[PDB]
Amino acid sequence: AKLHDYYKDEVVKKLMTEFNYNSVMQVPRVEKITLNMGVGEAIADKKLLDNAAADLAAISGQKPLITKARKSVAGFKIRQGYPIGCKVTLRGERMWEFFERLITIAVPRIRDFRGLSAKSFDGRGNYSMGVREQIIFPEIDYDKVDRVRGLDITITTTAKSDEEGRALLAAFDFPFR
Amino acid sequence: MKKDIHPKYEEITASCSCGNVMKIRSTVGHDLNLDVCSKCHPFFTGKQGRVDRFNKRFNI
Amino acid sequence: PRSLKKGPFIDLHLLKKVEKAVESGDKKPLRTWSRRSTIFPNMIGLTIAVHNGRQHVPVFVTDEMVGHKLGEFAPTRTYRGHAA
Amino acid sequence: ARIAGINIPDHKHAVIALTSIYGVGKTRSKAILAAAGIAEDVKISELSEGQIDTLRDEVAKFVVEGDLRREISMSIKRLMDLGCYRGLRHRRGLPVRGQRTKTNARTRKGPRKPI
RNA sequence: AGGGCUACACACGUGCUACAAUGGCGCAUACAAAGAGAAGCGACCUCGCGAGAGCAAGCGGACCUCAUAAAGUGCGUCGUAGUCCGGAUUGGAGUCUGCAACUCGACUCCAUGAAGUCGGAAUCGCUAGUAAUCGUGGAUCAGAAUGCCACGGUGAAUACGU
Ligand SMILES: [Mg+2]
Ligand SMILES: [Mg+2]
Ligand SMILES: [Mg+2]
Ligand SMILES: [Mg+2]
Ligand SMILES: [Mg+2]
Ligand SMILES: [Mg+2]
Ligand SMILES: [Mg+2]
Ligand SMILES: [Mg+2]
Ligand SMILES: [Mg+2]
Ligand SMILES: [Mg+2]
Ligand SMILES: [Mg+2]
């Protein structure tokens, strides 16, 4: 990774002396990144999930997992076990490289970009964000886009509180408005 | 990671308009040329009234 | 719009009424029929009751209404929908 | 290929292609191309990246795209909050510039609503 | 004095503009008729992207002004796309008339770019310089035509028959 080097060098020290931490593992870490795609339009055409999954593979660089309806839901014509989404869990080198890609190419490519909310913390130091469109990523080609599919991005951390989560995500200059 | 199931994830090059070059692994195959990066976007660097409107046309 | 070389238009009588109102400190609602007069900066904070055809409607002047005409804030037609 | 946060057609002449930007009509397109030294009948595909950055800087001098949309929304919303006749016409979705409503007015009113 | 005749779930009549390539846009360049003008028509020159502004001739007119006709023709481009079609709607900025353009003017500039891809049942005009299409002028009128009245340009098809 490249941003793990930045974490280990700068972010730990700055957060240590900002939060009066006893031990270096009391400092929040970024432990995993999860990217999913709600592709319930698969109900109509399976080909959809396949194309959404290939988009996700292009974005993330690892093959996604096809996720299934946990139940049968009468409001969307889905049975228990019908595939309606994808997911990739990135940890380590791949998640750090994705963090840099998203921070330094992807988010500048969002229409009308004016910062990401800092109230989007789940309550325990985990941040989630959406991506109306996928072209925001340079890994997806434009003159071939079959459909306009967004995605969700969640950053699970060891930060016990939203404050410690913002603090860590800010050390990387995460664009918070 | 598993074998032969993953997209070809090779280190590419990516050059911005303001002269920013980042050596990035991604699954595109070719190199990258992008208009705006994190270091030349209005929000990242911090670049993102009726009495005046009335008085612009109203030099007394 | 009125030509800029002419300046904004306002009826003289209402201009004097407003000038007195700012001078006395007064906030008694100003009665006027000059729907055609432009709202001026010194009108801000005053309440001008603008005739709409049958009744004077109170218009508490703010900063944003400067440059508009008084009549823009006193609708003359009454409409509540058809088949109502 | 990409200007002002949107993609512009590579196959079109430059004057036509630049009009895809919200806030750039033909007149602004010609002005932008004249100030960037680029001919008008040049296809966007056959332009150097440096020429495209020149076009990006020229477009930057105008308010376009989301900035323009926010400006237009703010103007309408100011009118609507003000409660002036123009703002009330915006509220009801009726013609704002004095047009007849006894007939026509279908662009503001939309498709006919049978009784 | 201010408001209304300008309202707006809706139904009809008469029109205008379109839906494009027999076209749109750009550059160049031909050929009319009729008419109006003194609180009027207003040139040239200067300023403005423009509507216009300033200065200011001439003309009560076969003399001066309104006032370059447009379609057309040549060259280029667009290449069948809701488009370089369409120009509604709306935001901003203006001009002029007029004591005064909020209700409720016309026009300009920048931006916006809706419906519409030729129209169900039904139904209208036209037999020749007609229809169709293209501009031009006048009355009313401070300002305010897609209406009305008038003028030329290009210019068809068809009529066996009752
Ligand atoms: Mg009208
Ligand atoms: Mg009437
Ligand atoms: Mg057009
Ligand atoms: Mg006349
Ligand atoms: Mg005569
Ligand atoms: Mg349509
Ligand atoms: Mg077509
Ligand atoms: Mg006959
Ligand atoms: Mg005609
Ligand atoms: Mg007239
Ligand atoms: Mg004729």
Swiss-Prot record, chain B:
SUPFAM superfamilies reported for this sequence: L28p-like
PROSITE patterns: RIBOSOMAL_L31
Chain residues that bind Zn(2+): 16
InterPro entries per record: Ribosomal_bL28/bL31-like_sf, Ribosomal_bL31, Ribosomal_bL31_A, Ribosomal_bL31_sf
Cleavable signal peptide: none
UniProt GO MF annotations: rRNA binding; structural constituent of ribosome; zinc ion binding
Keyword Metal-binding: yes
Keyword Disulfide bond in annotation: no
UniProt keyword list: Acetylation, Metal-binding, Ribonucleoprotein, Ribosomal protein, RNA-binding, rRNA-binding, Zinc
GO CC annotations on file: cytoplasm; cytosol; cytosolic large ribosomal subunit
Xref: Gene3D superfamilies: Ribosomal protein L31
A family per Pfam: Ribosomal_L31
GO biological process: cytoplasmic translation; negative regulation of cytoplasmic translational initiation; translation; translational initiation
Result of changing residue 18 to S: Binds Zn(2+) normally
Modification sites for N6-acetyllysine: 8
Cofactor: Zn(2+)
Assembly behavior: Part of the 50S ribosomal subunit.
Family: Belongs to the bacterial ribosomal protein bL31 family. Type A subfamily.
Database matches in HAMAP family: Ribosomal_bL31_1
Function of the molecule: Binds the 23S rRNA.
Official protein name in the record: Large ribosomal subunit protein bL31
Gene name of the record: rpmE
